[PDB]
Amino acid sequence: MESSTDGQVVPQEVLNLPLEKYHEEADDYLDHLLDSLEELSEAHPDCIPDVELSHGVMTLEIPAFGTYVINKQPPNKQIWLASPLSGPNRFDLLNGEWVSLRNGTKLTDILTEEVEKAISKSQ
């Protein structure tokens, strides 16, 4: 986390779907996810959490409720949210908003509400 890179294989997206926008949002989305969790687990975790970042995947281990994961490297275009147990959520991109259920629920919404009621359920 400090270096930089680039990947421009000719303006082949300008004629088709907004590929650049997809890599920009998805890149910032996953990055911001592991960035916030990393700072929260390092600044004030709880027991011994672990934030891992993979190419198109955001692993987040939580030694209290389980392990949360969020990737977007499907055979098409979606964000899989691996629950703290073993339940990936296939979220679809919505004009810049990943929601599941043909437009019903949101990722950060289910993850924030789930983790909130999962960690607060006791505290």
Curated annotation (Swiss-Prot):
It comes from Saccharomyces cerevisiae (strain ATCC 204508 / S288c) (Baker's yeast). Changing D46A: Impairs resistance to iron-catalyzed oxidative stress, no effect on Fe(2+) delivery and cell growth. This is Frataxin homolog, mitochondrial. Changing E42A: Impairs resistance to iron-catalyzed oxidative stress, no effect on Fe(2+) delivery and cell growth. Disulfide bonds: none annotated. Changing D31A: Nearly abolishes ferroxidase activity, slows down oligomerization, impairs resistance to iron-catalyzed oxidative stress, no effect on Fe(2+) delivery and cell growth. Changing W80A: Impairs cell growth, lowers aconitase activity and strongly decreases interaction with ISU1. The gene is YFH1. The lineage of its organism: Eukaryota, Fungi, Dikarya, Ascomycota, Saccharomycotina.
